[PDB]
RNA sequence: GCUCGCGAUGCUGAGGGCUCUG
RNA sequence: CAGAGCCCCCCAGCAUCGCGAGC
């Protein structure tokens, strides 16, 4: 019943692991098998009773080059924390839908009207990201073991490798830097046997710490949302994590209004999780609050065991978003969208968000940390049917 | 305090086998 | 079908140590 850093940390770890318990027949389910667990916990006050597990996810793999969807039906990245953020997106959509059904529901929604336009978060609402381990890339690649109590020092802080943007690589292990002669990925190229690169999770969370967690489409509706804390259940290295999360791009400049370099609370837990026994599960469990049960997606194909699209895929989210745009008057829009059709275009409508993202990419380039690796354009070139 | 090159030893997503278990 | 253990091999980075060169 407190709001100290460590008490908070242990609290959200406890809550997420517990909720995952409730969602998997108390860890008996075959879908309880996991290597990395992640989740998001909301707080609406300094008391732990005012804390609510929003989303829970597992997974350690990414889609194969073969199975990319030009329709956006696949999950490109099923590393636990990424999936957690996507589930959080679903929750946000649920809350916007809450605000827009009847005036009676508004008092129970986490959103309210914004004197700058569109919607914003009610005071004292905070989100907290939990990961059972350090996010792949800069935050963990150096020292993938627990820290030792005598020498927590990097011992080689000023190396070029430090802070560098790195990518998950298809069919290979370790998270590798970006190529100096990195011919940007092509759709037909990747489908023709080329190796798919995906930005590491450290890099992605830094990105979230600049452009927000809501992504481009929700910035049409809502003001930027940031994580107030990042809790690691194991492999917590303060200096490395702090570097990866924000510190390495302190040199960033000229951010659009309401956009800051978020520096969330970083904290491990008192009792670190031991490495989960057995093979690393082929799949990725997800769950958002207000759902009947978990959803199991095959991480290699980005779909479930029967080829059905996930509720977290680009398409589904776009459908939710479209259904929110229908119910929102143009004078409550932060950005002008008027008549939306294509995914990529609707993303580009969030001009401020896109400018912030540009500032991020430039921030990384100037520090000598590399150029961000985008999916081929064809990925976001689709509409609903 | 670094960078590059060459080695040595480890650490961290594929592919292919062997054995066992419900 | 599902799971476990072991083995072989690949992946391109990271760590440690040792040589050579340079800032
Ligand atoms: O949760 P993630 O797997 O990281 O998904 C993101 C997300 O794409 P969706 O929200 O459409 O799934 C980004 O979209 P934003 O909301 O940040 O705009 C997109 O960024 P772009 O807008 O630049 O496409 C990025 O893809 P990219 O690789 O192009 O950065 C992509 O990440 P993945 O491509 O790794 O799924
Ligand atoms: Zn990751």
Q: What's the per-residue H, E or C state across chain A?
A: CCCCHHHHHHHHHHHHHHHHHHCCCCCCCHHHCCCCEEEEEEECCCCHHHEEEEEEEECEEECCHHHCCCCCCCCCEEEHHHHHHHHHHHHHHHHHHHHCCCCCCHHHCCEEECCCCCEEECCCCEEEEEECCCCCCCCCCCCCCCCCCCCCCCCCCCCCCCCCCEEEECCCCCCEECCCCCCCCCHHHHHCCCCCEEECHHHHHHHHHHHCCCHHHHCCCECCCCEEEEEECCCCCHHHHHHHHCHHHCCCCCCCCCCCCCCCEEECCCCCCCCCCCCCCCEEEEEECCCCCCEEEECCCCECCCCCCCCCCHHHHHHHHHHHHHCCCHHHCCCCCCCCCCHHHHHHHCHHHHHHHHHHHHHHHHCCCCCCCCCCHHHHCCCCC
Two tokens, residue A155: 């011992």
Two tokens, residue A260: 């800051």
Taking a 5 Å cut-off on Cβ, the residues next to ion ligand 2 are A 79, 136, 201
Quote the CA–CA distance of A270 and A8 in Å, as a whole number.
Answer: 11
CA angle A184, A165, A133 (to 5 degrees): 125
* Solving technique: X-ray
Quote the CA–CA distance of A96 and A32 in Å, as a whole number.
Answer: 31
Whether A218 is in the pocket of ligand 1, judged by its Cβ within 6 Å, is no
Question: Which of A59, A64, A68, A76 for a ligand 1 pocket mutation test, highest count of atoms within 8 Å of Cβ?
Answer: A76
Quote the CA–CA distance of A308 and A298 in Å, as a whole number.
Answer: 10
Quote the CA–CA distance of A224 and A258 in Å, as a whole number.
Answer: 7
Nucleic strand B contact set for A 289-318 (CB, < 7 Å): 300
Strand C, nucleotides covered by protein (CB < 7 Å): 2-5, 10-16
Q: Which bound ligand lies closest to the C-alpha atom of A136? A: 2
A320 is in an annotated binding site: no
């Amino acid at each position: 019943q407190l709001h100290l850093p460590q008490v908070l940390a242990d609290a959200v770890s406890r809550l997420v692991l517990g909720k995952f318990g409730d969602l998997t027949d108390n860890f008996s389910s075959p879908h309880a098998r996991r290597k990395v667990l992640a989740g998001v916990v909301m707080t609406t006050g300094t008391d732990v009773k005012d804390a609510k597990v929003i989303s829970v996810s597992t997974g350690t793999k990414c889609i194969n080059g073969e199975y990319m969807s030009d329709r956006g039906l696949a999950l490109n990245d099923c590393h636990a924390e990424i999936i957690s953020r996507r589930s959080l997106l679903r929750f946000l959509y649920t809350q916007l839908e809450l605000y827009l059904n009847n005036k009676d529901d508004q008092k129970r929604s986490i959103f309210q009207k914004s004197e700058r336009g569109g919607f914003r978060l009610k005071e004292n609402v905070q989100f907290h990201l939990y990961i059972s381990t350090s996010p792949c890339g800069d935050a963990r690649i150096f020292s993938p073991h627990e820290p030792i109590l005598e020498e927590p020092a990097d011992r080689h802080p000023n190396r070029k490798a430090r802070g560098q943007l790195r990518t998950k690589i298809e069919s290979g292990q370790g998270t590798i830097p970006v190529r100096s002669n990195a011919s940007i990925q092509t759709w037909d190229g990747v489908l023709q046997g080329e190796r798919l690169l995906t930005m590491s999770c450290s890099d992605k969370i830094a990105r979230w710490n600049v452009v927000g967690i809501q992504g481009s489409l929700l910035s049409i509706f809502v003001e930027p949302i940031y994580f107030s804390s990042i809790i690691l259940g194991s492999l917590y290295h303060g200096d490395h994590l702090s570097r990866a999360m924000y510190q390495r791009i302190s040199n960033i400049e000229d951010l659009p209004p309401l956009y800051t370099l978020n520096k969330p609370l970083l904290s491990g837990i008192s009792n670190a999780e031991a490495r989960q026994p057995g093979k690393a599960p082929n799949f990725s469990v997800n769950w958002t609050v207000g759902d009947s049960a978990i959803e199991v997606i095959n991480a290699t194909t980005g779909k479930d065991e029967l080829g059905r699209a996930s509720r977290l895929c680009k398409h589904a989210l776009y459908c939710r978003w479209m259904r929110v745009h229908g119910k929102v008057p143009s004078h409550l829009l932060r950005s002008k969208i008027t008549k939306p059709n294509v995914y990529h275009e609707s993303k580009l409508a969030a001009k401020e968000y896109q400018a912030a993202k540009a500032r991020l990419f430039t921030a990384f380039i100037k520090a000598g940390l590399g150029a961000w690796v985008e999916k081929p354009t064809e990925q976001d070139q689709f509409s609903l049917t």
